[PDB]
Amino acid sequence: KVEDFKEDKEKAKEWGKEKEKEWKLTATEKGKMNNFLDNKNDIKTNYKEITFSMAGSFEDEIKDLKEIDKMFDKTNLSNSIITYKNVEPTTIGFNKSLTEGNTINSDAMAQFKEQFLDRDIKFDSYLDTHLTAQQVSSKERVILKVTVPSGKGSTTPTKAGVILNNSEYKMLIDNGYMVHVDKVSKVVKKGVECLQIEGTLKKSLDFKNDINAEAHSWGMKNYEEWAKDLTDSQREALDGYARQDYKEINNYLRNQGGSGNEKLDAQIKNISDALGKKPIPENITVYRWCGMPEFGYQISDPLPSLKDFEEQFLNTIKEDKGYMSTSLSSERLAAFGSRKIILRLQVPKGSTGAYLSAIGGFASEKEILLDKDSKYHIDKVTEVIIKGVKRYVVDATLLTN
Numbered sequence: 001k002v003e004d005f006k007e008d009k010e011k012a013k014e015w016g017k018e019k020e021k022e023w024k025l026t027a028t029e030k031g032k033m034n035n036f037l038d039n040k041n042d043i044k045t046n047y048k049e050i051t052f053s054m055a056g057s058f059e060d061e062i063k064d065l066k067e068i069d070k071m072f073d074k075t076n077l078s079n080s081i082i083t084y085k086n087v088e089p090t091t092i093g094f095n096k097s098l099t100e101g102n103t104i105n106s107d108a109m110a111q112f113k114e115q116f117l118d119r120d121i122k123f124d125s126y127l128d129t130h131l132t133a134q135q136v137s138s139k140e141r142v143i144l145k146v147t148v149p150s151g152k153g154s155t156t157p158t159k160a161g162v163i164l165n166n167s168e169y170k171m172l173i174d175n176g177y178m179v180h181v182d183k184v185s186k187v188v189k190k191g192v193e194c195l196q197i198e199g200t201l202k203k204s205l206d207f208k209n210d211i212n213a214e215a216h217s218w219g220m221k222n223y224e225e226w227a228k229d230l231t232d233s234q235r236e237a238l239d240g241y242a243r244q245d246y247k248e249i250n251n252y253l254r255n256q257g258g259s260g261n262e263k264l265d266a267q268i269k270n271i272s273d274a275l276g277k278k279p280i281p282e283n284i285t286v287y288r289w290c291g292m293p294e295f296g297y298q299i300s301d302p303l304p305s306l307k308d309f310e311e312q313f314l315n316t317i318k319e320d321k322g323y324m325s326t327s328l329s330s331e332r333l334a335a336f337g338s339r340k341i342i343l344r345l346q347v348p349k350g351s352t353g354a355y356l357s358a359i360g361g362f363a364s365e366k367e368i369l370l371d372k373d374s375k376y377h378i379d380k381v382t383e384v385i386i387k388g389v390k391r392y393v394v395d396a397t398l399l400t401n
């Protein structure tokens, strides 16, 4: 069943007052949740940076995040409901001028619908929405009308709950969900034009900087068996790849037409056959810190303007003839802690790849290796300043064949 209090604040208050009970939270926890919400100590302000930070940094914040994680771990969302939240266009990666006064540009909408309609929107942190439409604030001209599926008698429980913040009951949705845009239209609230995104939640695992070390377990829990059932041919090739062969193999595939080397072709065949035995069991999020050359730039070039970057990659499909290595953790590691482009990749259930870390040995850390000839769709680009330097987080959806 689907609720929607629209603009009835009282009847929503009752509802929020009731689900506020279902969430198994002590007053101590509630306080801790509100601190993050009211951005105590700039934790909400630095959250995004935090998720892409190097280990050791933001210790105390991490300790609060680990406590807040354990809280969504107790969400018993029983009823489906329609939440409302207004946001500035920049917050969801829309970087084109959206309004001109109380009016919607027009080219803006075209551009807007082209970028999001029927697409998934990935957010940086826990989404907090309202139970009733909110007055269009300053520049917060995008109205998000997200339908939150209770998914009670459903397989996976909807990790969402109601909290009482600032004299108001609000919906709090865990990191692991994106908003699939179902419909986009122009609406008018009190003489002011805004864009309204009607969408539904869509689950997608996202370990972020893996603060509770849940990534490796998820990986093993799903690919330990796959690892065991590999042939010694496959086990060995994958071990060669991981150890050092990857440099020679990727180069061959990316630059030498992937032809002309009997030896490699054979190893490549085992690797790919291994990689296909078990499609990714569910929608997951992987990460990858990229070097400028990977996006057509020079090793010593600064990031181009955010505008130029969108003109070049926004809405395009980037390919890779080689094998793409990604990670379940967005954690910044010394090996490449200074890359300026971070890929936030959505791997849909059924993608061709495997959690390589399952083979142990020379294997890498928390690695999801995608099969060669991969292709993904760049959905949106946003900025994040990590320890001083500006980086570009490029959200994309993997195309599954």
Ligand SMILES: NC(=O)c1ccc[n+]([C@@H]2O[C@H](COP(=O)([O-])OP(=O)(O)OC[C@H]3O[C@@H](n4cnc5c(N)ncnc54)[C@H](O)[C@@H]3O)[C@@H](O)[C@H]2O)c1
Pocket (backbone or CB within 6 Å): 242, 246, 254, 287, 288, 289, 290, 291, 293, 294, 319, 320, 321, 322, 324, 325, 326, 327, 336, 364, 365, 367
């Ligand atoms: N960088 C990451 O975020 C990350 C994440 C998980 C695992 N790894 C690991 O690091 C090791 C090396 O791989 P890597 O992923 O860091 O790569 P890398 O970026 O260091 O690869 C070096 C080269 O591959 C390139 N490349 C060339 N054509 C490309 C194309 N068409 N598409 C994509 N890249 C292209 C780069 O431009 C560069 O020339 C592996 O052993 C792997 O386990 C890295």
